[PDB]
Curated annotation (Swiss-Prot):
Record localization: Nucleus; Chromosome
Protein name: Bromodomain-containing protein 1
Organism: Homo sapiens
Tissue expression per record: Highly expressed in testis.
Subunit text: Component of some HBO1 complex composed of KAT7/HBO1, MEAF6, ING4 and BRD1/BRPF2. Component of the MOZ/MORF complex composed at least of ING5, KAT6A, KAT6B, MEAF6 and one of BRPF1, BRD1/BRPF2 and BRPF3. Interacts (via PHD-type zinc finger domain) with unmodified histone H3. Interacts (via PWWP domain) with dimethylated and trimethylated 'Lys-79' on histone H3.
Gene this protein is translated from: BRD1
Length: 121
């Protein structure tokens, strides 16, 4: 149908906007602490601690398969990155401190993206 295509055109535009958002969020991680999943070879007990791991590469695979239906789903995944890190790592570590910084710097990007998604529909 023509409806299904128009729907698909909007998913594709949401995907374009979220791609730009993802890039902007990932620039706030210049150390690449959150680039890739936590290694199970190097942290073998990780899944005893964290039940839903998340990272920027895994968000990128979902993004390019148009797997985010809305911004809420995308933000849930970004918060997992941050929240997992703040639980697994202690306060006085470079990892926890990197999460805090990504959260604070990410918030501004996310604020405007919500406006843009609401505004453009
Ligand atoms: Na902790």
């Amino acid at each position: 149908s023509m409806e299904q295509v128009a729907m698909e055109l909007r998913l594709t535009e949401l995907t374009r906007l979220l791609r730009s958002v993802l890039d902007q969020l990932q620039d706030k991680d210049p150390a690449r602490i959150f680039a890739q999943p936590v290694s199970l070879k190097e942290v073998p007990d990780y899944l005893d601690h964290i039940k839903h791991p998340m990272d920027f590469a895994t968000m990128r695979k979902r993004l390019e398969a148009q797997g985010y239906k809305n911004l809420h789903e995308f933000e849930e995944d970004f918060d997992l990155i941050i929240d997992n890190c703040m639980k697994y790592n202690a306060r006085d570590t470079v990892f926890y401190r990197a999460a805090v910084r990504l959260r604070d710097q990410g918030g501004v990007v996310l604020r405007q993206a919500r406006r843009e998604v609401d505004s453009i529909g």
